[model samples]
Target: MEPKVAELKQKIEDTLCPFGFEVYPFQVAWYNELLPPAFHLPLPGPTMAFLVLSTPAMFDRALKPFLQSCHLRMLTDPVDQCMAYHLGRVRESLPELQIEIIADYEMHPNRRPKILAQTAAHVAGAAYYYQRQDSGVCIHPRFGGWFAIRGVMLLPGIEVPDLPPRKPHDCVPTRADRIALLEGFNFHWRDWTYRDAVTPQERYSEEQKAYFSTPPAQ
Candidate 1:
C-alpha cells in the first residue's frame, strides 16, 4: 500500500511539478492530531491526504499560461481557478482512485474555509507554520512565504495505518526572527516584507508581485 502511495504521489508530482506546484502526502490522522475538532477532516483517521502547494514559479510556469489559454469558470480568483483546473486534470487521470479535493478557498454554508491550509501544509512537511499573537505565516523551506498552500487531496479508500508523520522544517527559528516575522505580517504585510523572513530559493517576480498587489478583478 505504501509503495502504491509512492507511485500515486510520483504521478501527481510529474503532473504538477513542471508548473511549479508540489505535493506532499500525509495521513488524515496526522492532520487530525494537530487541529481542533471543528477543523478536522471527517474521514477515518488513517486515510491518505496529499497537501498541495504553489511555488513562486507558478506565476510564469502555470498561472500566466492558464490565463492566456484556458477559459475559466467560477470567476472568483484567477490563481485559484488555475489550481482548480490543474487539480481537475489530476482527478481525470486517476479514475481508478476515489479521491476528494478540499481547496484552501472552499467555503461552507457558514462561510468557513473547508481546510486550514497552513495546518495541512505543516502536517505534510511542506512548510513551517509560524504563529505569534494574532498573526502568522507559512514559510516553505525552499520558497519561504513566496509559496501558497492551495489544497488537500484525499485518497478515500487508501489508508496508511503505519505511515509516520513528517515534521516541516523550521525556517524561522530565532526569537527575534519570529517577532520580526509576526510584526512584519501584522504591520507591514502590504509591503510583503514578512515573506523575506527566511531566504527563499525562489521568490515572486516583480510582475507577479504587482499582480497580487492590484485588485483581483484586473
Candidate 2:
C-alpha cells in the first residue's frame, strides 16, 4: 500500500517539478486535525493527499511555455488555465488511479474557499505557515511568501495510517519576529511586506510582477 503511495508521489513530482512546482504528502487526518469540522474532507481519516505549490520560477518555467502553446481563453485567468493543463497531464499519466484535483480559486457559494490550501501546505510541510489568531500565511523556506499554494490532490482509495506529520521549516520561530510578521500581514497586506517576513532566495521576475499588478480587465 505504501509503495503505491510512493509511486503516485514520484509520478506527480516527475510531471510537475520541472515546471517549478513543488509537491508534499500528508494524511487526510493531519489536514482535518488542523481545521474546524466545517472544512474537514468527507474521506476517511487515513486517506492520502498532496499539496502543490508554484515557486517564483513557475512564471517563466511553466506559465510562459504554457501561454505559447495552449489556446487562451480571455475570461479565465491565464495562470489557472496553465495550471490545469499541467495538472491534467499528471492525471493523464496515471489513468488507473483516481486523483481529485482542487485549486485555490475554487470556492463555495458564500465565498469561503473550497479547500484551505495554506492549511494543507502547512500540514504537509510544504512551507512554514505562520498563524496570528484567525489569520495566517504560509512562507516557503526558499521562496518565502513568493510562492503560491496551488491546491491539493486527494486519493480516497489510498490510506497511510502510519504516516507521521512532517513539521514545516520554522522560518520565523522567535516571538518577536512572529509578532512583527503577523502585524505586517494584518495591517499592511496590500504592500506585500508580510511576504518578506523571511528573505526569499528569489522573487517573482519583473515580467511576472507586471502581469499580476495590472488590472484583469484593462
Candidate 3:
C-alpha cells in the first residue's frame, strides 16, 4: 500500500521543527498540501541550503572561530528555512533534505545548475542531492556534477508525488563519501589555508555594509 501523504508530511514537519525557522501556519498548510501534487512522487534533487560566514579575524590571524561556527552543524537549517519557504510545498514533508555549505571556492562547483538556467534562477551558491539508491533517477535531474552537503536533512515521509525511481548519473556521491572528499569537511571553510590568504572582514554587501555600518552615535 502507498503511504498516507498527510502522515508522511507530519513526520517530515516534526523533523524540521528542531531547525527553528519562522514557520507560519499558512506556510505549514501550504507545505502539506502542495508538495505531493506538484512534483514527481519522490523529490527530484536533495533539499540544499547555506550561509555566508562573516568575521574579520579570518584575514587577520586565520579565523579559527569563524570556521568552527560555520561547521556548527545547524548552519544548513537556516538555508533550508529559506529554501523550504521558497519551495513551499515541494520542500514540505521532505525533512531529510540535504544542506550544502558553499565556501568561497566551493560555491561555484556546488551551485545548483537548473536554477542557473532559469530567468528567475533560484539555486545560486549551494547544491543539494536527493535520490533513492534503488531508484537512481535522483542524479539525472541534478546533473552529474553537484557539490557535497555541509549537512544533510532527510525526507522520511512526504512523498514528492508521481515519481518512479530512475538511474542516477555516474559517480553519485553519498554523504559519507562526500564528507571524505572535501578539504574543509571537518574544518570550517575559514579553516582552509587559502582563506587566510585573503583579508577577511565582517563581509557584507554595500547595502548591508551601509545599513550595519551606520553610526551607533547617530
Candidate 4:
C-alpha cells in the first residue's frame, strides 16, 4: 500500500471504528475465487480509481473532527452514510464546492438478492480510471448476466491503488450483447432514459443525468 493510502486507511479506522464499522481484511476465499465474474466484478479497482481523482480534495483537519463525531445512526438509511462521508470530504477539501444530494427511494437496476448469485447474474463489464481515462475491464464467463451495478462512493484527494488492470478477456460483452443476452426477457437497447418513467430512473434524474453523462452535456 502507498504511504498516503495507509494514512487514509488509518484515518478511516479512527473515524469509523468507534462508529461500529469493522474493517474486513481484503482477500477472497475459494468459494469466492471460484465464483463467476458475475460474482466478482473487481469493484475496488474502479472505486479506487474514482477515489484517486477525488482525494486531494478530501484531506483536512477540521473535517476529521466532524467526520469522527458524525453519528451514522442519525441517518435512516445506510447509503446516506456513504453520501455523508463523501460530502464531508468535499466540504473539507473545497469550501466553495456545493453539492445537492437527492435521496432516492426506489429499486435500482442493480438490485439483486443473494440467491441470484448462482446463475442468472454476470459481471458483464467494468471500467477503471488510469492515467486519467476510463478504460474497460472484463470479468467472468458463464454466469455473466448475474452481476449488477450498484451504489458508487466518491473519494477525493486519495491515492489510487497501484493494482494493475485485469488481464483482457474477450469474453466481455459489448453494447451489441444486450439482445443476445436478454432476447427472451423483453430487453431493448436505448440510451439511458431518465424522466421517461413515473419515478426517477437510470443513473440520475433526466436533468442531472444530462449534466453528468459521459462527455457531459451542457
Candidate with maximal lDDT: 2
2 or 4, greater by lDDT? 2
At residue 59, candidate 2 shows an lDDT of 91
TM-score of each: 0.91, 0.91, 0.21, 0.26
RMSD of each: 2.2, 2.2, 16.8, 16.2
Error of 4 at 117 (Å): 11
Q: State the lDDT of candidate 4 residue by residue for 1-218, as single tens digits.
A: 77755665565445534432322112122113446666542333333321111111122322234446645455344334544564355345434423222212222356431222211112212311011121121122322322122222223333254434342133523544433333322333243221121121122325433433446222
Model 3 lDDT tens row, 82-200:
33332343344444453222223322444432111111111221222232331111111222121112221223222343332232223434565444324332344434332222223
- The lDDT, on a scale of 0 to 1, for candidate 3 is 0.29
Stretches of candidate 4 exceeding 4 Å from the true structure: 27-32, 43-109, 112-218
Clashing pairs in 1: none
lDDT of 2 by residue, 1-218 (tens): 56877887899999999999998888989988867888888788999888889999889998888688746667788887888888899999889999888876663457533687777878899898788652777788888889998878888788899888789999888889888888888888788877888888888879998998888763
By summed lDDT, which 10 consecutive residues of candidate 4 come out lowest? 49-58
Looking at model 2, which ten-residue stretch has the lowest summed lDDT? 105-114
Please give the lDDT score at residue 175 for candidate 2.
Answer: 87
After superposition, the stretches of candidate 3 with alpha carbons farther than 4 Å from their true spots are 1-4, 22-218
**Steric collisions counted per model:** 0, 0, 16, 14
lDDT of 1 by residue, 1-218 (tens): 66788788888899889998899989999888877888788889989889888888888999888788846656488888888888988988777898888776784456443687777877899998888642677888887788888888988889888888789988788888888888888888787777877778877889988898787675
Q: What lDDT does model 4 reach?
A: 0.31
